[PDB]
């Protein structure tokens, strides 16, 4: 939240379980979209598609974000998007130094 | 912005092979070039700052509907980041890559009659910088070897000594030359100096600064590819390999 | 600014065909550029000279 | 026959055709929103005796922190807005703002760029032509209220025809003395003081009896679609600031006393529908320009 | 359950970030903006946290 | 001798040559399918007191959520659909839709852009030329049903030549009074009220007795290959909407009262087969435009 | 000079002022939905070899279970719809159906009752005024397509003034032979076969030569806001059925061959913008009456 | 759209829905007819007191 250049990523198992999908959806829903890379975004979509659409990682390896989103929506999964985080303006009172 | 970030002959040529011709052209009408204008630069002056519009600015401008205009728009995109307004070219030509237009006879475009003197004059070369001139000379070299005009390219360079001094050294048909080349062709990048959010007087400088500050925002955004952190996530086709070479080279 | 595919139909919708194709560029020194019409009023050489011939007649 | 017409309807110069897409209209919408917050923060700073609210608002607007010894001019957003305003006014004005700059500033806030949510009422009275016979004198003065002075010198009563165009929705005519007005090929009613006319009815004929001059005061109202954030008072002030700042000094352009006359004159021209869309965007930009300049002043 | 907890406890974490940034001086913050990094979290830890 | 022709067959302007490839034709089909679902979702949502079916339909079509206080134009698809219609009508109309936008929008639905699955019947009657000798006046009026009024002022009976082109399949001629019709170098039969002719048979000769004027009513049918989703009723309404909306205001073009007259006129022109293929794609585009604009008026 | 006018533009009779409020508009929309379900139910009943789908639809529409030996008439809703249609046509209709019954029937289904959701295009051509000088003859025939036959018997060319009103959006003029047309006090262009004009522009002048007649065929398009469930084909069929059934037989009224003629004629009156609102509600009522009567013949 | 939905629901006594003209409900009709009544003594008063 403090530093915008910082990023978050996670690595999943070769055969994901329900825990991996829950972790992927929680990261997409609640972490800032500005902190999730495009490569990480595709990896999360691949993990979701592997568990839900009953496919392996090699089959969906050469798939774009548009194709993965379409595959997941056809199955009935709506969480295929990244959500930008609102910015809160903060002020530090001066006291004995110039403020920030 | 992506084209202006390429710093080597390999990266620049690889990008031109991937991108299509529609990126080089623009669908905004813009204004006309070579026009004396009064622009507003209030951070410096109260009056209106005079300047002259050109094809090298990063703003779209109306262009001629001929092969000469098409080549000027391609070089403008490479050296400035935006092209011109030449519509109704045809979907057959617009699908092909910029490199294919420049160095392949299969496209169907005829560029043999093009003269490098007026093209350099129109794409104002007295106002370019060293990096911009190098990219233009790359495009001239690619075109010359396409139509078998290598001798004409050499004579043109011998007439203009400063262009010869900074002319990149590579044979358009050989990939070993591209690998060995160590010219710096980057117009935008992470600056060692202090880059501030301030305006510049000239049209060219103001637009160039906007691209520079834009690249910093894009560099720190989520669209940038940090190789040291996520090299195992890229597909195998687009992964960096030394065996990789341009098609037909 | 336009190319055509080989082994395609040669018919075109328009009945009047320009010497310079849809690309609107003619390589100088070719036959097509030689048979192109010349501006007489706009060109100072041709207008000056034309008056000389009419005066002689 | 002698012909007279409104001064402000003569030769409307063409308007710009650039920065009229979805992204550009979004950028102008963002500029107006951030300019409004700049004015409010300056007030909040003054009643609170702390520079913190103003600094934060300026940081959003200019993407930079204010520093002493450097004049606060608005940064890159002010530069883009000023040059874009010039481009809207005339087709001779250059387009020198890159697209990557417009996209960057449009993303600073999440507002809709739609410019047709609401409407506004404009008060300029369009008199396209007034035709009078040989022995009569007609003079037209004014734009917010038009005074038409008519004198009859000949022996007989004269017939003067009035054309108000097809854009205005209503026109109200009041005379110094009661007078007769009726549509073409219609009977003339009893002399009255006021008339309410729809300009689409057609040319109107007014009988001018011989004697003292007759003066008609014309008031018109027309409706133009504008964004819901459109404020007429702010737009007029921005129009005057732009004219005084010297950014309407382009070659071969017409000058107007208010934004009311500018938008109506462009409406009463060929392809007037397309010109009005561009002029509405320029009006919102002038609203942003006014608020930004008052917040950050120069002497 | 994740949504309900997030809506219940966002105020406390918003205050926490504000307090932490209050501890950083200005010169240190601008210097830290030049650096960048990516943090790797195990999937079990991410779900258990929420 | 005098010649007269149908008004709508004169000087067909060149149609556009852009957005006729496979991917572009898939875009028009995708727009047609999604614009139809917009109409059905509106009816279902209204009847089921829930707006959730409409939100899904609009989100798929426009790539953004429906929000109040917004015009609800239709997103990028409405812009792309509007511009391709303008480029189809004329060859000087600029093509300002990127190929990336076409492919991105075409991937929303899985359709085949084949424009030769089915056929449609068009009722415009192509009277190419009527040749009349001296002291005879011939006048042609109408396109859906042509009325040819001929008067014989001269002393003797005259021969009027009819040329219906070579494209139409059947032309039915009815007269106010019985008349004689036969092909070139054929015996003239007894006077009848109606005639069925094949335009490929040849020029037709009509005898004109001296006296009261003779009026002939001509009805024609032509078959043109169209996609299966083609609907003539929707195309006609969409054609009128486009003309009203100003999509065809490009200079140096001709204007027609209906799509039936437009498609037939281009067929009776040089490179007619190539022209008709473009006009069919414009027809499906106009049908998608009608459904979308009725769902989302602006 | 002489004056010529369209036949259907003469004396539009006043329309009804009852059943215009929101509750009544809801009833008409409810009737259209329920009447439509009647037709599809019967088709489903025939295909499924069972009358249960039709029984449920009729019970909802008529509030009475169908019986084999008893005639099916539609019940109270059929009577209310018939009486409502009569009230709309003329201001002199009794308007007997109460408001409590209207509210009860409107509760049968959940519909918007929105009269301005969408639009439709009407193809009737209004020719308000044709001015012809002496020694010329002008005749106007047609409503969907208007043919103006003009013949000049004078010495020189004559000027004919056209006036298409201010309501229509675009008018396309087609001539039997090329002719010259321009604005009032405007230079003439070269002779062309077709013209596209906006009626709001002003009266037009047609130069009529001497010797040969000229016929101008005009087609016009007008946009009128209508509900999203509007269907021109069903409305026109309902219009003819209501006329035959005698619902429009009231003293001191005018009669029209098409619904487009009816709606356009009232839209040219002095209070036309208020008359169309009643006309639009009447059209949707005729839509329900068409579907209801075909499924339940009298 | 939450602030607008709450305000419009209060004004028009109806939840805003898509595919509706957003006229304003009974209050807009009452407001319009009342304005006509004030201007002239000839204008009808067609708004019930209840």
PDB file of N, CA and C in Angstrom, chain E:
ATOM      1  N   UNK E   1     -16.848 -15.199   3.584  1.00  0.00           N
ATOM      2  CA  UNK E   1     -16.108 -14.966   4.818  1.00  0.00           C
ATOM      3  C   UNK E   1     -14.969 -13.978   4.600  1.00  0.00           C
ATOM      4  N   UNK E   2     -14.259 -14.102   3.477  1.00  0.00           N
ATOM      5  CA  UNK E   2     -13.182 -13.165   3.178  1.00  0.00           C
ATOM      6  C   UNK E   2     -13.721 -11.755   2.969  1.00  0.00           C
ATOM      7  N   UNK E   3     -14.849 -11.630   2.270  1.00  0.00           N
ATOM      8  CA  UNK E   3     -15.436 -10.314   2.038  1.00  0.00           C
ATOM      9  C   UNK E   3     -15.899  -9.676   3.339  1.00  0.00           C
ATOM     10  N   UNK E   4     -16.537 -10.460   4.210  1.00  0.00           N
ATOM     11  CA  UNK E   4     -17.059  -9.914   5.457  1.00  0.00           C
ATOM     12  C   UNK E   4     -15.939  -9.427   6.365  1.00  0.00           C
ATOM     13  N   UNK E   5     -14.861 -10.204   6.482  1.00  0.00           N
ATOM     14  CA  UNK E   5     -13.730  -9.777   7.299  1.00  0.00           C
ATOM     15  C   UNK E   5     -13.076  -8.530   6.723  1.00  0.00           C
ATOM     16  N   UNK E   6     -12.950  -8.468   5.399  1.00  0.00           N
ATOM     17  CA  UNK E   6     -12.304  -7.329   4.760  1.00  0.00           C
ATOM     18  C   UNK E   6     -13.082  -6.043   5.015  1.00  0.00           C
ATOM     19  N   UNK E   7     -14.412  -6.106   4.927  1.00  0.00           N
ATOM     20  CA  UNK E   7     -15.226  -4.929   5.211  1.00  0.00           C
ATOM     21  C   UNK E   7     -15.236  -4.595   6.696  1.00  0.00           C
ATOM     22  N   UNK E   8     -15.041  -5.594   7.553  1.00  0.00           N
ATOM     23  CA  UNK E   8     -15.066  -5.358   8.990  1.00  0.00           C
ATOM     24  C   UNK E   8     -13.776  -4.721   9.489  1.00  0.00           C
ATOM     25  N   UNK E   9     -12.640  -5.044   8.870  1.00  0.00           N
ATOM     26  CA  UNK E   9     -11.338  -4.698   9.427  1.00  0.00           C
ATOM     27  C   UNK E   9     -10.501  -3.820   8.504  1.00  0.00           C
ATOM     28  N   UNK E  10     -11.119  -3.119   7.553  1.00  0.00           N
ATOM     29  CA  UNK E  10     -10.330  -2.258   6.680  1.00  0.00           C
ATOM     30  C   UNK E  10      -9.928  -0.966   7.374  1.00  0.00           C
ATOM     31  N   UNK E  11     -10.730  -0.503   8.334  1.00  0.00           N
ATOM     32  CA  UNK E  11     -10.410   0.740   9.028  1.00  0.00           C
ATOM     33  C   UNK E  11      -9.123   0.612   9.828  1.00  0.00           C
ATOM     34  N   UNK E  12      -8.941  -0.513  10.518  1.00  0.00           N
ATOM     35  CA  UNK E  12      -7.747  -0.684  11.326  1.00  0.00           C
ATOM     36  C   UNK E  12      -6.479  -0.727  10.498  1.00  0.00           C
ATOM     37  N   UNK E  13      -6.535  -1.381   9.339  1.00  0.00           N
ATOM     38  CA  UNK E  13      -5.352  -1.473   8.493  1.00  0.00           C
ATOM     39  C   UNK E  13      -5.070  -0.166   7.770  1.00  0.00           C
ATOM     40  N   UNK E  14      -6.107   0.615   7.461  1.00  0.00           N
ATOM     41  CA  UNK E  14      -5.891   1.923   6.852  1.00  0.00           C
ATOM     42  C   UNK E  14      -5.165   2.856   7.809  1.00  0.00           C
ATOM     43  N   UNK E  15      -5.527   2.813   9.092  1.00  0.00           N
ATOM     44  CA  UNK E  15      -4.837   3.622  10.090  1.00  0.00           C
ATOM     45  C   UNK E  15      -3.404   3.138  10.267  1.00  0.00           C
ATOM     46  N   UNK E  16      -3.195   1.824  10.187  1.00  0.00           N
ATOM     47  CA  UNK E  16      -1.860   1.266  10.370  1.00  0.00           C
ATOM     48  C   UNK E  16      -0.897   1.782   9.310  1.00  0.00           C
ATOM     49  N   UNK E  17      -1.346   1.838   8.058  1.00  0.00           N
ATOM     50  CA  UNK E  17      -0.488   2.320   6.981  1.00  0.00           C
ATOM     51  C   UNK E  17      -0.156   3.791   7.184  1.00  0.00           C
ATOM     52  N   UNK E  18      -1.136   4.579   7.631  1.00  0.00           N
ATOM     53  CA  UNK E  18      -0.902   5.997   7.867  1.00  0.00           C
ATOM     54  C   UNK E  18       0.128   6.210   8.969  1.00  0.00           C
ATOM     55  N   UNK E  19       0.050   5.412  10.033  1.00  0.00           N
ATOM     56  CA  UNK E  19       1.000   5.547  11.131  1.00  0.00           C
ATOM     57  C   UNK E  19       2.407   5.156  10.701  1.00  0.00           C
ATOM     58  N   UNK E  20       2.533   4.102   9.893  1.00  0.00           N
ATOM     59  CA  UNK E  20       3.853   3.656   9.459  1.00  0.00           C
ATOM     60  C   UNK E  20       4.523   4.692   8.570  1.00  0.00           C
ATOM     61  N   UNK E  21       3.763   5.303   7.661  1.00  0.00           N
ATOM     62  CA  UNK E  21       4.342   6.318   6.788  1.00  0.00           C
ATOM     63  C   UNK E  21       4.715   7.574   7.562  1.00  0.00           C
ATOM     64  N   UNK E  22       4.009   7.863   8.655  1.00  0.00           N
ATOM     65  CA  UNK E  22       4.364   9.008   9.484  1.00  0.00           C
ATOM     66  C   UNK E  22       5.765   8.871  10.063  1.00  0.00           C
ATOM     67  N   UNK E  23       6.266   7.640  10.182  1.00  0.00           N
ATOM     68  CA  UNK E  23       7.584   7.416  10.760  1.00  0.00           C
ATOM     69  C   UNK E  23       8.711   7.661   9.767  1.00  0.00           C
ATOM     70  N   UNK E  24       8.410   7.730   8.476  1.00  0.00           N
ATOM     71  CA  UNK E  24       9.435   7.878   7.444  1.00  0.00           C
ATOM     72  C   UNK E  24       9.643   9.351   7.118  1.00  0.00           C
ATOM     73  N   UNK E  25      10.866   9.861   7.189  1.00  0.00           N
ATOM     74  CA  UNK E  25      11.127  11.237   6.759  1.00  0.00           C
ATOM     75  C   UNK E  25      11.043  11.357   5.242  1.00  0.00           C
ATOM     76  N   UNK E  26      11.004  12.606   4.778  1.00  0.00           N
ATOM     77  CA  UNK E  26      10.780  12.856   3.359  1.00  0.00           C
ATOM     78  C   UNK E  26      11.964  12.403   2.516  1.00  0.00           C
ATOM     79  N   UNK E  27      13.184  12.740   2.937  1.00  0.00           N
ATOM     80  CA  UNK E  27      14.357  12.392   2.140  1.00  0.00           C
ATOM     81  C   UNK E  27      14.503  10.882   2.004  1.00  0.00           C
ATOM     82  N   UNK E  28      14.178  10.140   3.062  1.00  0.00           N
ATOM     83  CA  UNK E  28      14.228   8.685   2.988  1.00  0.00           C
ATOM     84  C   UNK E  28      13.190   8.142   2.016  1.00  0.00           C
ATOM     85  N   UNK E  29      11.999   8.743   1.986  1.00  0.00           N
ATOM     86  CA  UNK E  29      10.927   8.215   1.151  1.00  0.00           C
ATOM     87  C   UNK E  29      11.240   8.376  -0.331  1.00  0.00           C
ATOM     88  N   UNK E  30      11.720   9.554  -0.736  1.00  0.00           N
ATOM     89  CA  UNK E  30      12.093   9.754  -2.132  1.00  0.00           C
ATOM     90  C   UNK E  30      13.234   8.839  -2.554  1.00  0.00           C
ATOM     91  N   UNK E  31      14.168   8.554  -1.648  1.00  0.00           N
ATOM     92  CA  UNK E  31      15.232   7.610  -1.968  1.00  0.00           C
ATOM     93  C   UNK E  31      14.686   6.200  -2.146  1.00  0.00           C
ATOM     94  N   UNK E  32      13.721   5.806  -1.316  1.00  0.00           N
ATOM     95  CA  UNK E  32      13.165   4.462  -1.402  1.00  0.00           C
ATOM     96  C   UNK E  32      12.291   4.268  -2.633  1.00  0.00           C
ATOM     97  N   UNK E  33      11.828   5.350  -3.256  1.00  0.00           N
ATOM     98  CA  UNK E  33      11.015   5.226  -4.459  1.00  0.00           C
ATOM     99  C   UNK E  33      11.819   4.773  -5.670  1.00  0.00           C
ATOM    100  N   UNK E  34      13.147   4.871  -5.623  1.00  0.00           N
ATOM    101  CA  UNK E  34      13.969   4.416  -6.737  1.00  0.00           C
ATOM    102  C   UNK E  34      14.065   2.898  -6.798  1.00  0.00           C
ATOM    103  N   UNK E  35      13.899   2.216  -5.667  1.00  0.00           N
ATOM    104  CA  UNK E  35      14.055   0.769  -5.608  1.00  0.00           C
ATOM    105  C   UNK E  35      12.753   0.089  -6.005  1.00  0.00           C
ATOM    106  N   UNK E  36      12.828  -1.207  -6.295  1.00  0.00           N
ATOM    107  CA  UNK E  36      11.655  -1.993  -6.639  1.00  0.00           C
ATOM    108  C   UNK E  36      11.905  -3.439  -6.244  1.00  0.00           C
ATOM    109  N   UNK E  37      10.819  -4.175  -6.050  1.00  0.00           N
ATOM    110  CA  UNK E  37      10.934  -5.574  -5.686  1.00  0.00           C
ATOM    111  C   UNK E  37       9.603  -6.274  -5.824  1.00  0.00           C
ATOM    112  N   UNK E  38       9.674  -7.602  -5.827  1.00  0.00           N
ATOM    113  CA  UNK E  38       8.499  -8.457  -5.879  1.00  0.00           C
ATOM    114  C   UNK E  38       8.542  -9.415  -4.703  1.00  0.00           C
ATOM    115  N   UNK E  39       7.442  -9.496  -3.965  1.00  0.00           N
ATOM    116  CA  UNK E  39       7.346 -10.361  -2.799  1.00  0.00           C
ATOM    117  C   UNK E  39       6.581 -11.624  -3.158  1.00  0.00           C
ATOM    118  N   UNK E  40       7.125 -12.769  -2.766  1.00  0.00           N
ATOM    119  CA  UNK E  40       6.506 -14.061  -3.019  1.00  0.00           C
ATOM    120  C   UNK E  40       5.855 -14.568  -1.742  1.00  0.00           C
ATOM    121  N   UNK E  41       4.564 -14.873  -1.822  1.00  0.00           N
ATOM    122  CA  UNK E  41       3.787 -15.359  -0.691  1.00  0.00           C
ATOM    123  C   UNK E  41       3.260 -16.743  -1.031  1.00  0.00           C
ATOM    124  N   UNK E  42       3.372 -17.665  -0.084  1.00  0.00           N
ATOM    125  CA  UNK E  42       2.808 -18.988  -0.287  1.00  0.00           C
ATOM    126  C   UNK E  42       1.287 -18.894  -0.356  1.00  0.00           C
ATOM    127  N   UNK E  43       0.642 -19.691  -1.211  1.00  0.00           N
ATOM    128  CA  UNK E  43      -0.824 -19.616  -1.306  1.00  0.00           C
ATOM    129  C   UNK E  43      -1.529 -19.900   0.007  1.00  0.00           C
ATOM    130  N   UNK E  44      -0.966 -20.770   0.847  1.00  0.00           N
ATOM    131  CA  UNK E  44      -1.577 -21.037   2.143  1.00  0.00           C
ATOM    132  C   UNK E  44      -1.567 -19.797   3.024  1.00  0.00           C
ATOM    133  N   UNK E  45      -0.467 -19.043   3.004  1.00  0.00           N
ATOM    134  CA  UNK E  45      -0.365 -17.855   3.844  1.00  0.00           C
ATOM    135  C   UNK E  45      -1.340 -16.774   3.402  1.00  0.00           C
ATOM    136  N   UNK E  46      -1.509 -16.598   2.091  1.00  0.00           N
ATOM    137  CA  UNK E  46      -2.388 -15.546   1.593  1.00  0.00           C
ATOM    138  C   UNK E  46      -3.838 -15.809   1.975  1.00  0.00           C
ATOM    139  N   UNK E  47      -4.295 -17.053   1.817  1.00  0.00           N
ATOM    140  CA  UNK E  47      -5.672 -17.372   2.170  1.00  0.00           C
ATOM    141  C   UNK E  47      -5.883 -17.331   3.677  1.00  0.00           C
ATOM    142  N   UNK E  48      -4.907 -17.816   4.446  1.00  0.00           N
ATOM    143  CA  UNK E  48      -5.059 -17.831   5.896  1.00  0.00           C
ATOM    144  C   UNK E  48      -5.082 -16.421   6.465  1.00  0.00           C
ATOM    145  N   UNK E  49      -4.337 -15.500   5.851  1.00  0.00           N
ATOM    146  CA  UNK E  49      -4.328 -14.119   6.316  1.00  0.00           C
ATOM    147  C   UNK E  49      -5.700 -13.477   6.175  1.00  0.00           C
ATOM    148  N   UNK E  50      -6.354 -13.681   5.035  1.00  0.00           N
ATOM    149  CA  UNK E  50      -7.665 -13.088   4.810  1.00  0.00           C
ATOM    150  C   UNK E  50      -8.769 -13.830   5.550  1.00  0.00           C
TER     151      UNK E  50
END
